[PDB]
A = this chain, B = another copy of it.
Amino acid sequence: LLEKLKKLEEDYYKLRELYRRLEDEKKFIESERIRYEREVRRLRSEVERLRSPPLLVGVVSDILEDGRVVVKSSTGPKFVVNTSQYINEEELKPGARV
């Protein structure tokens, strides 16, 4: 009865202090989490963007109605390549750097 309630009160009090004390130690940790969040995102994004396979420049030197477009590449030689579905043969005129 009386004995029962006092033991509960003591035990709530005891653990209230334990959590309050721990909270502090991890508040310092949260501040750092945020710091690290900014950098996790910014670093990863700038590396993958530069790492991308170099998109070489060609100039639509010839064109055909069969899908093939002869692009004089800036490496030296010409290549005959077939264009994607993003770019269309309507967009590809002579003099068009691609």
Supposing A15-B16, A74-B77, A74-B78 touch, asked if A33 and B23 sit within 8 A by C-beta, the answer is no
Most buried by B among A13, A37, A43: A43
A15 to B15, CA, bound (A): 10
Asked if B79 contacts A56 (CB within 8 A), the reply is yes
Q: How many copies does the complex hold?
A: 2
Q: Contacts of A76 on B, CB cut-off 8 Å?
A: 74-76
Report how many residues on chain A are interfacial, defined by Cβ distance under 8 Å: 53
Asked if A55 contacts B26 (CB within 8 A), the reply is no
Asked if A54 contacts B81 (CB within 8 A), the reply is yes
Task: Give the residues from 32 to 58 in chain A that come closer than 8 angstroms, CB to CB, to chain B.
Answer: 32-33, 36-37, 39-40, 42-44, 46-47, 49-52, 54-57
Which 3 A-B pairs rank lowest in CB-CB distance, beginning with the nearest?
A26-B26, A19-B19, A9-B9
